Design a protein around this motif. Sequence first.
Motif, mmCIF file in Angstrom:
data_model
loop_
_atom_site.group_PDB
_atom_site.id
_atom_site.type_symbol
_atom_site.label_atom_id
_atom_site.label_comp_id
_atom_site.label_asym_id
_atom_site.label_seq_id
_atom_site.Cartn_x
_atom_site.Cartn_y
_atom_site.Cartn_z
ATOM 1 N N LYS A 84 0.750 3.163 8.504
ATOM 2 C CA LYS A 84 0.851 2.532 7.184
ATOM 3 C C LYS A 84 0.793 3.629 6.131
ATOM 4 O O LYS A 84 -0.255 4.229 5.927
ATOM 5 C CB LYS A 84 -0.263 1.489 7.043
ATOM 6 C CG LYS A 84 -0.036 0.568 5.837
ATOM 7 C CD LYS A 84 -1.272 -0.306 5.584
ATOM 8 C CE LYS A 84 -1.011 -1.530 4.693
ATOM 9 N NZ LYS A 84 -0.409 -1.209 3.373
ATOM 10 N N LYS B 250 -3.345 5.715 8.649
ATOM 11 C CA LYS B 250 -3.202 5.182 7.287
ATOM 12 C C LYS B 250 -3.153 6.361 6.324
ATOM 13 O O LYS B 250 -4.088 7.154 6.300
ATOM 14 C CB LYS B 250 -4.334 4.204 6.954
ATOM 15 C CG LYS B 250 -3.939 3.341 5.749
ATOM 16 C CD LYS B 250 -5.104 2.558 5.139
ATOM 17 C CE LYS B 250 -4.535 1.501 4.191
ATOM 18 N NZ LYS B 250 -5.485 1.082 3.154
ATOM 19 N N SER C 120 -10.668 -1.109 3.977
ATOM 20 C CA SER C 120 -9.821 -0.957 5.165
ATOM 21 C C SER C 120 -10.601 -0.584 6.421
ATOM 22 O O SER C 120 -11.674 0.014 6.343
ATOM 23 C CB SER C 120 -8.795 0.171 4.974
ATOM 24 O OG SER C 120 -7.959 -0.009 3.859
ATOM 25 N N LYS D 277 -7.236 8.580 8.928
ATOM 26 C CA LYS D 277 -7.193 7.974 7.594
ATOM 27 C C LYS D 277 -7.185 9.096 6.567
ATOM 28 O O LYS D 277 -8.176 9.799 6.403
ATOM 29 C CB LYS D 277 -8.366 7.003 7.432
ATOM 30 C CG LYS D 277 -8.236 6.165 6.155
ATOM 31 C CD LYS D 277 -9.514 5.348 5.938
ATOM 32 C CE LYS D 277 -9.382 4.229 4.895
ATOM 33 N NZ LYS D 277 -8.974 4.723 3.553
#
Lengths: 73, 73, 73, 73, 73, 73
Positions: A65, B65, C11, C65
């Motif tokens: 993402k 992400k 998240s 992340k």
Amino acid sequence: VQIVYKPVDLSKVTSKCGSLGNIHHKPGGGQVEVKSEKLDFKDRVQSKIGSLDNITHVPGGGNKKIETHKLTF
Amino acid sequence: VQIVYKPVDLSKVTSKCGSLGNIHHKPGGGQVEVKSEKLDFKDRVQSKIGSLDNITHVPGGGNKKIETHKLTF
Amino acid sequence: VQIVYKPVDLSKVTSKCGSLGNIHHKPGGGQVEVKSEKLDFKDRVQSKIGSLDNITHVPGGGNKKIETHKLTF
Amino acid sequence: VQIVYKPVDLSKVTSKCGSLGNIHHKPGGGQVEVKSEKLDFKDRVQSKIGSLDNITHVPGGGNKKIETHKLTF
Amino acid sequence: VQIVYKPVDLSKVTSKCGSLGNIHHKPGGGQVEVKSEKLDFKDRVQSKIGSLDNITHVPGGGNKKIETHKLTF
Amino acid sequence: VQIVYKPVDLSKVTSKCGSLGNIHHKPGGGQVEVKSEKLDFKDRVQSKIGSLDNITHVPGGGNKKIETHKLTF
């Protein structure tokens, strides 16, 4: 001037999988033979011979993402 | 001037997997043979011979992400 | 001027996996042979020969992340 | 009765060769998987599984002279 | 009765070879996986699993002269 | 009755060779896995599992001269 920048994200990026496997990568299994005679090089040489830079990438998820937000005045 | 930057995020990036395995990467399994004679080089040489830089990457997730935020007045 | 920069993140980046294993990386399994005669080099030489820089990376998660924020004046 | 059995042999069985080499034998390089359930055997079982009895024979000569002589009265 | 079994041999069985080498025998390079359930055997079992009885034979000559002589009155 | 059994041999069995070498025998390089449940045996079991009875034979000659003589009255 009033600026309200108020995006909301509730998304899911999801994978579900069984067993992941029995993967074979065999690059350059054959004979490589290089014969060179009497070459002149008057500038730079980069030479790669054999089996180089090969990737086997097998992620159990591998989801991405990627997201970007910008404001300017 | 009023600027109100309130992005909200509840997003999940997810994988579920069985067993991950039986992965074979065999780069350069073959004979590599280089024969060089009487070569002249008047400038820089970079040489790579054999099996180089190969990657096997097998993460149990490997999910990404990536999230960028900016403002400028 | 009023600037309120109040981004909110709830998240998760998640993996779940079975057994992770039976991974074989065998770079450069073949014979590598280099024969050189009467070569002249007049500037820098870099040589790599055999099995170099190969990677086997097998993390039980390996999730990323990555997040970036900027404000400017 | 007179019997004279007087054969004469002056033969040669000859090989001449350059270099002999770069020979690859790789039997059973692939995955072998056997799953058996609820079998009944009422008599003898011989089982061979995997890579058995393979030969690599590379003689530098390998010549044969095979000869037989017989007399009977 | 006169019997004169007088065979004569002056033969040669000969090889000449260059270098003999770079021979690879790799039987059973692959994964072998046997799973068995609820099997009944009422008589003898012989089982061989994996890599068995494989031969590499590289004689620098390997020449054979085989010779048989018989007389019978 | 007169029997003269007077065979004569002046033969040679010969090899000449360069260097003999660079021989690789690698039987059973792969994973061997055996799983068994609820098996019944009512007579003798012979089981061989793994890497057994494999030969690497590299004689610098390896020549054979085999000869047999018989007389009977």
